[PDB]
Amino acid sequence: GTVVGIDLGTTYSCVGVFKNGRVEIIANDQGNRITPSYVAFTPEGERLIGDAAKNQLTSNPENTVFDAKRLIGRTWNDPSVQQDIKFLPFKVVEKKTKPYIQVDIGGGQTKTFAPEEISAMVLTKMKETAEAYLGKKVTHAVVTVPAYFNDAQRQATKDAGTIAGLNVMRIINEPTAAAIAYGLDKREGEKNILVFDLGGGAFDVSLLTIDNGVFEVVATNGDTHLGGEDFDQRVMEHFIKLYKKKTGKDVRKDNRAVQKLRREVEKAKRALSSQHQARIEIESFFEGEDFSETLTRAKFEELNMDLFRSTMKPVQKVLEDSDLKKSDIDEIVLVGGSTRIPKIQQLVKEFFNGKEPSRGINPDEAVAYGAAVQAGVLSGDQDTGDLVLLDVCPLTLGIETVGGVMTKLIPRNTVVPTKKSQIFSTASDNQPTFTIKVYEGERPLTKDNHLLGTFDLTGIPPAPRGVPQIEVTFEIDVNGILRVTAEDKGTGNKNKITITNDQNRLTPEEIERMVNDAEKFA
Amino acid sequence: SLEARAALNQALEMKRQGKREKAQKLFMHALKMDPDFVDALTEFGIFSEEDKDIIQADYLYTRALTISPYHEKALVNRDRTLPLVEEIDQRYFSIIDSKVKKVMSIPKGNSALRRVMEETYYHHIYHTVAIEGNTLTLSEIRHILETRYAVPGKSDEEQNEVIGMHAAMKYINTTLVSRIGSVTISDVLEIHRRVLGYVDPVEAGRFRTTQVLVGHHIPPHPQDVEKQMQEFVQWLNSEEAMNLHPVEFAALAHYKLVYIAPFIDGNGRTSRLLMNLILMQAGYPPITIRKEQRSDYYHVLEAANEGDVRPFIRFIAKCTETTLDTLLFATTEYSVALPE
Ligand SMILES: *P(=O)(O)OC[C@H]1O[C@@H](n2cnc3c(N)ncnc32)[C@H](O)[C@@H]1O
Ligand SMILES: [Mg+2]
Structure with a gap:
């Protein structure tokens, strides 16, 4: 059928379709071209997704779920997860060392969801939005991820797609999608573009060389836990503290109070992008008492200035990685809802010595637009011509070797897909196994890098220590996802080396159950 | 692979322009998408031959012909490089x-x-x-x-x-x-x-x-x-x-x-x-x-x-x-x- 492009955002999602040589961004049942990444369960047992879910947040906060994009592919322990918990009204519980969501689904029946299942529901709503417009069922999608998403976050997004009953034909990096939206109609030849992508919860900077349908990522750098959500948290925390200073009342107890403040903080932040102060008014805020405060643009900026200034570091990083001057940048492309913030536009403009950003780029829709184009290409039946993406892996991949050493195999900014092989050996006589610990990061010791996964390699034949020649191969596919394989390079019996997948990610049996659970609401 | 075809077409266009570094990247991308892509092996051979790497050109023409023995352009190319190698x-x-x-x-x-x-x-x-x-x-x-x-x-x-x-x-x-x-x-x-x-x-x-x-x-x-x-x-x-x-x-x-x-x-x-x-x-x-x-x-x-x-x-x-x-x-x- 029709392959759709879905921007699966932290706060909002957007679906587009490529038909008759152009992109249509599809309005949902409420006429909105962007859909809140929200799900909710009513006391009656009705599953709400999108606007309906977000609009009952303040009356049912404990059983309203959002921010799933900042939970997928992370540990329970993650300081970033613990930060968000303080501002999330729903129970986040540790299950297999990962943050699961526990909600009352109705009739005093509690269900515990993987963050992948929440994102699956959001993807289901975006699919339903497309199906309503197309008047035919949608089975295939291109889904976007932040460029700086690690292996686990990418796989979790694919898994969310699978659970939503979608064939995810391709995971596309959000800034690369944005570059396609900018570059498709342009026939200007070779250009260097800086895509600055500050969305609801993730920040990416990608430097691309675009050239008459070729989209070449030169360098990428970002932060998968920096965006609109963090700016809202800073303002919420400010006003929760101000309330305790004024009244003595700690409002962190009342979830309805905290989430009422969240809703009004979002409205205020949006207002402050076109005016210099916003009134925050809440009736029956805490213990039947009213809230009334002014937020100035200056105060909003002060509360977030460290975070705003921090967005310049990845811009500096991609220029350094690419060995390009500021003057080599032909276009600055601002995408993600948070690039509407005047101070963000000002910091980028001043970094590039007064250079204005590209005109006619809707920062809320550009990522979905690009996803829709790539969906059209992979559909194979949309006459899209010779569009070629040459994307890169965002993180250096390595294997832990004796002494907790980061043995680097694939450097950051390597074009994907890619393959790297290296021969390793045993640390003791007749060692029958490798515990292959794959790390993401730059540090020479793995303790200072991020564990991608643990892979059990079995069937190493008996031999003295350091004698076996076990080739370990890293393959990064076109989705940016790692496969680990191994081969004895020596003479051996017919029984090849076996690698068992990491046991700490969702198995096919777990995904099958989550798929079957999701199908019931079809 | 329609993807592989697109990459080869762009490789040939960039080669025409003299963007040889980009052309090489696009040839390599085409052959990742389809390792047995005979047109891509043959054209990447031509690219090697232009850089006066006759052994690599001939290697690629020969590899192409092992997949497609009657491939016209690979046959002509291999017949040229055979005595040179x-x-x-x-x-x-x-x-x-x-x-x-x-x-x-x-x-x-x-x-x-x-x-x-x-x-x-x-x-x-x-x-x-x-x-x-x-x-x-x-x-x-x-x-x-x-x-x-x-x-x-x-x-x-x-x-x-x-x-x-x-x-x-x-x-x-x-x-x-x-x-x-x-x-x-x-x-x-x-x-x-x-x-x-x-x-x-x-x-x-x-x-x-x-x-x-x-x-x-x-x-x-x-x-x-x-x-x-x-x-x-x-x-x-x-x-x-x-x-x-x-x-x-x-x-x-x-x-x-x-x-x-x-x-x-x-x-x-x-x-x-x-x-x-x-x-x-x-x-x-x-x-x-x-x-x-x-x-x-x-x-x-x-x-x-x-x-x-x-x-x-x-x-x-x-x-x-x-x-x-x-x-x-x-x-x-x-x-x-x-x-x-
Ligand atoms: P066994 O230890 O008896 O022999 C090892 C030798 O085999 C040769 N060899 C390695 N890899 C290959 C492949 N791929 N094809 C053919 N022969 C191979 C090397 O001479 C080793 O020393
Ligand atoms: Mg031997």
């Missing part, structure tokens, strides 16, 4: 032949050659066991063979591999190198019996009865080993083989034997010994495939598996030149001049 490969053999004659031109009053040849012998045992993962140092190997004393805190297996190699080389140099007549299966078994004799005296000097793997290579079923070894030794003693350049003869002898992999173990050690028997019978010094070349060695063997043995022949040729260069450098005499 023969000229290039033969020129390298001529350079190697000159350097062999340079080694033989060393005066018999040269003091350095005697000691260098002795050192090189122990270097040969080090490299042939080390390339297979043996952890013994050159000094440890010298100690094992000169003294016969066991090195402490090292496996019996690794030491028994070295003792076996010493026994095998002594047998070859004293019985086979100077012997008149055909090289038989029985001769190869006698070499293997010494190679593996101290590690595995049960398997030493007999063909495997089980299926083995050799890295990525799947050798014949054990029941087919005798017949393939008979066909191998027929080729070894053929006038066709005798008419090859000794480097090509020795390289093909090595490859043909490890392809069969007739033994449970020691196929590489035995094949490298046979390679050097052939070179030494042809009047060449024995050559070394260095421990550090392990990864390159496996790559060109895999290239041979995939249907082009020439990268392996060229690899063995370069090992031969390196051996000759090292021998000539090590035996250089530095002249004393009168001020005048």
